[PDB]
Symmetry: C6
C-alpha cells in the first residue's frame, strides 16, 4: 500500500502477512456474505493495483465469481478508456504517461508507475479507482450468491419475531448490494405478529415493533 511514514511523506510499503491472511480467511469463513465487501475495502486501505490483484489472486476457490469480477473490471475499464482516451505515440522523456483502464487494473502498468500516479501532485488515485470497480463487481457477486429473494422471507407460525427480522435484513443486505421494500417486513409477518403490528400503527419504529411482538 501507499501510506504516510512517521515523517509525513507518502511511500510504498509491502502488504503485511497479517493483511494477506485476514483476507484469505474471511473468504474461507464467510464466502460472499455481505460483510465480506466492507472487510475487503478496509483491508485494502491504501492499496495499489498490484496489491488489489494480490488480494484477489489469493482467494481460494470461487473461481466462477473471480471470472465474473474480471468481466466487471473490463467493462469499467472500457468506460474509463471511452471517457479518458490516452495519447497515442511516444511519451516525452522522463514524464508521466496517462493511465488507461488496463493500467488502473495493474495489468499493463508497473508498480513504479502505480506509485508515480498515486503520489503525484495532483494524484491520479489509481488504487481507489480500481477498488471502486472491484467493489462494484463484488456487490454483483454478493447478490448472486444470496440464496433467497426478500419476497420469500416470511415469518413462521412459531418463529420469534426477532429471528424473523434477523433473516429479513440479512437477506435485504445481500439483495440490495448492487425503501418501501422494508414494508415487506410487516406484510410477511405471521398472523399473530401482523395483528399486533397493524394495531400498533404505521409510524412505529423497529424497536417498538420488536418490543410489541415479544
Amino acid at each position: 500500500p501507499i501510506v504516510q511514514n512517521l515523517q509525513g511523506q507518502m511511500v510504498h510499503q509491502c502488504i503485511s502477512p497479517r493483511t494477506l491472511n485476514a483476507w484469505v480467511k474471511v473468504v474461507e469463513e464467510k464466502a460472499f456474505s455481505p460483510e465480506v465487501i466492507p472487510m475487503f475495502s478496509a483491508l485494502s486501505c491504501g492499496a495499489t493495483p498490484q496489491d488489489l490483484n494480490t488480494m484477489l489472486n489469493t482467494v481460494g476457490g470461487h473461481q466462477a465469481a473471480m471470472q465474473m469480477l474480471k468481466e466487471t473490471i473490463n467493462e469499467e475499464a472500457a468506460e474509463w478508456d471511452r471517457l479518458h482516451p490516452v495519447h497515442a505515440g511516444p511519451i516525452a522523456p522522463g514524464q508521466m504517461r496517462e493511465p488507461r483502464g488496463s493500467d488502473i487494473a495493474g495489468t499493463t502498468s508497473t508498480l513504479q508507475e502505480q506509485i508515480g500516479w498515486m503520489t503525484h501532485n495532483p494524484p491520479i488515485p489509481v488504487g481507489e479507482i480500481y477498488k471502486r470497480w472491484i467493489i462494484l463487481g463484488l456487490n454483483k457477486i454478493v447478490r448472486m450468491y444470496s440464496p433467497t429473494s426478500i419476497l420469500d422471507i416470511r415469518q413462521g407460525p412459531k418463529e420469534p419475531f426477532r429471528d424473523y427480522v434477523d433473516r429479513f435484513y440479512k437477506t435485504l443486505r445481500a439483495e440490495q448490494a448492487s425503501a418501501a421494500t422494508e414494508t415487506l417486513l410487516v406484510q410477511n409477518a405471521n398472523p399473530d405478529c401482523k395483528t399486533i403490528l397493524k394495531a400498533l400503527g404505521p409510524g412505529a419504529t423497529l424497536e417498538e415493533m420488536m418490543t410489541a411482538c415479544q
Copy 2:
C-alpha cells in the same frame, strides 16, 4: 483512525486488521452482553465515521439490531440538524462546508471531509459525535437482548448469595437507566429478594452495610 505523527501532526492511519478482527470476534463470542459496548468504544478509539461504519458493517448476523442502530442514528442526526442547521444554498467553491447529521454518520461525507473536520483548528470531532450516537443505539440493543428483568432475579433456596448477587448485577448492568435509578433498584430489591436464611442475616446488618459485609456475612 486519526493519530499523531512525530512531526506532531494529526494524520489518518488505516484501520488495522487486528482491530477489525477483534471487533468481529467480540460480537461472535458475546453478542450484545453489556461488555460489548465498552469494547466497541475502546476498539474505535480515534475512529473516523468511515471506520465506525466499517466496524458496524463487518458484524455477522444480528441484522435486526443493526437496523435498530441505524434508526437510532437517524434520530440523533435529526436532532443534530435541528440544533445545528446548515445554511442552505451553494457555498464558496473550495472552502470547508459545515457537517450535517448524515455527514457525521459518514453517509454524505467523504473521508477527506471527515479528516478535514477532525483535524481542523478548532476540531469538529465528527468521529466522537457519531460514536456517541452509536453507543446510545447499542445501549438500547443491550437492554432489548437481556433475557431477564431485574424484578425476576430472586435468590434460590440453595443458591449461594454471591451467585445471586452476580445474577442481580449482570441483569442490572444490561438495563437502560441512570445510575440513580439502578442503585434505587438495588435498595428496593436486593435484600428483599434474598432467600429466607440470607435475608434474616442481611436485615440484622442494617441498611448501612456494605456489599462486602453482606457477602461476607452470608458466606
Copy 3:
C-alpha cells in the same frame, strides 16, 4: 494510556486490542486468583482513568465483585475529597481545575482533563491514584474469593510435602492480599514430616525442609 513517543514527549495513545483481550482473558481463565492483580497492574501501565474504566467494564460476569470494587473506589474517593477539597466556584478561564475523587475515577472528568493532569508540570497522576484504589479493591476481592483459610491447609498422610507447601503458599497469597503465620507450615504438616522438620531444627530454610521431607 499516556506514554513516551519515539521523540521523548508524553502523549495519549489508544489502548491496544492486545491489551484489551489479555485482560478479559486472564479473568476468564483465572477469575480472582491472586496473580490476576499483578497482571491487571502491568496491563494498565500508563493508563488514564478512562482506560481503567474500560478494562473493568470489559470483565465478563463477576458483577458482585465489580460492585464491591465500586464501593471501595467510592470510599477512597471520599477520603480524597476530605484531604483535598476543591475550590467551589467558577475556575479561571483557560486554567487547570483541581480534581475531586469522582474526577480521578473518570466519572466527572473528560479524557482531555485526565491528559492535562497526567502531563502537567508538575503532574497530578490521576491514573496512578485511581489504580491504587482499584488494586485496594481487587485485593479485597481476592481475599473474599479464597475458598479456604490458611488455618485449614493441613498436609494429608500420603501427601507429598512439596504438594502441601504449594497449597499452603497458594492459600497464603490470597489470604494476605489485603510473618509468624508461615510457622503454620510446620504445625500443619503430617506426623512423618513434622517429626523430620522438628529434628531438623528451627533455622531451616524452605529448601532444607523440602529436601528433608523428600
Copy 4:
C-alpha cells in the same frame, strides 16, 4: 528484505518470523494450488536473494518440486549469462563487480554484495530478477501438481452450473498458458461441456452473453 528508513535510505532489515511462518504454513495448507504463487510473491516483497533462498529452504517436503525449481533457476541463470556476460579476468580491487546468474540466485554472492547491487544508483534489482525466475518455476510446478486437465471438466447431470464453472476456472487457473490461450479454451469448452439442460439455455443467450448472465440464467 530491503526497506526505507526515516533518513530516506534503503537499508537491510531482517526477515520477520511472521513472514517466515506465513510462507511455511501456506505450503503446508495449500501445497501448490495456484494461489501459492501470489502469496509467495507478496510475502517476498523487498526480498534479497538470501531471503528468497531462506523461504524456499524452509518448505517442508515437496522436494521433487524444489529440485525442479532449482533446474528452472539454472536455466534462467544461463540465459542471463548469455545476455549479460561478465567480462572475465580479475577486476579492480575494492570496486563493485557485475553479477552473474549464480550471484542473482544468491549462491556465489554475499549478502553485502546483494545489498550493494539492490541499493546502487541505478539499482541492479537482483532480488526482483531472482524472484521472476522462481515464479516461472512455481508456474511449472502448479501445472504439474494440477490433478485435472481442462479437457476433462464437464458438467455433471445433477451438478449446479456454478459448481461446474468453479471447477472449470480452478483447473484453468493452474494451467501454464497465456491469457489468450486460456480464454480461447473457455470459448471452445465451457458451454460445449455443460450438461444438456444448461447447454440449451446458454446457446439461446448467444456467444455475447456475460458469465453473470450465463450463471443467472442457469440458476
Copy 5:
C-alpha cells in the same frame, strides 16, 4: 523495561502483553525444566526490578518454588548489604540515595528510583543485579524439581544409545554444578553405564573419541 529512544536516551517502556503472556505460558507448559531459566532471562531483557516482580508474581501455582526464590533473593540481598552498606542517617533532601538489597529487589524502591539508578551515569544496574539473584534461585529450583539423579541414568538393554545419551544430558542439565563438575560426571558415568553391547564398542574407540564418533559407532 528500559530501552533506547531515537534521541539516544534510555527511557522506560511498559512491559508488553506479549512478554507477560510468553512467560506465564512457558511455566504452564514446562514448569521448571532447565530451559525455563534461559527463557526467563531473555524475556526479562531490559527489565526493571518492578518488571521482574511482575513476571514472578504472574506465575500460576508453583508457590513452594516461589517462596524458595524469595528466600534466595533475601540471602543475596543480605550479602549485597554486607558488601555495599548504605551509610545510615538522613541524606541531602532531593538527591539520589544509594540502593540497598531490598531496593534492588523492588520492595523498598519506587519505579522512579529504579529508573534513576539504571539510567544514571555511571549506571547502577539494579535490574541486572536482581536478575542474577533470581537466576541463582531458579537454578536451585530446577535442581530440586529434577526427578532423576545422574547416578541412576543407565542404558536399557533395548534402548538406543542416542535415547540414553539424551536422558543423560537432560538430567545433567538440571543438576546445579560447575561445568567442570558436570563434565567429570560424564567422564565417570556415560560409558560406564552404557549397556553391554554399546559399552564394548565405546571402550574400543578409546577415551579420546568424540560424542559424534560414539553415537555413530553405536547406531
Copy 6:
C-alpha cells in the same frame, strides 16, 4: 540482536518473544529435519553470541545433539585460537581486547564486549563467526538424525514416481548437509519407470522425467 534503528545507527535490541517462540516450536515440530537449519539462521539474523546461546539453551530435549554441538564449537574455537592467538597480559586502559574462541562463543565475553566487537570500525563480527560454527555443528546433527542412506531410497513397484522423487531429495537434503549422486535417482527407480527413463535419454530434465513417468 544488533540492528539498525529508524535513524541509521547500529544498536542492541532485545530478542523478541516471537523469535524465541518460533525457534523453540520449529524444533518441537521438526526436530532436525534439514529445513530447521535455514530457519535457525534466519531467526538468528543479527544475533549476538549471547542471543545464539539463548536460542540453543531453549531447545527442549535433544540434549545429546546439543552436546555434539558444544564439541563442534570447541573444535572451531581451538582452530580460531590457533589462527588468531591473543596478546597475553593486561590490555591498555579503555581499549578493545582481541576475542578468543571462548569469547566468540559467549562463554568468556560480556554482552557489552560482544556489542563493542560487532559495532566497531572495522567490526569483528563475532555473532556471524559463532553462527558459522553453530551451523557447521547443526549440519552434522542433521546428517546423523537422517534415518536412511540415499543408497537405500528405492522406488516401490506401485509407488508413484513423484512420491519416490520426494523421498529421494528429502533424504539427499539431509545426507549432503555436512553431483553424480543424483544419478542414483534413475538407478533406484522401479522397472517400469526405469525403462521409460532410459528410453527418454540422459539429457532429460527432472520435469521431463516426472512427466514421462506420470
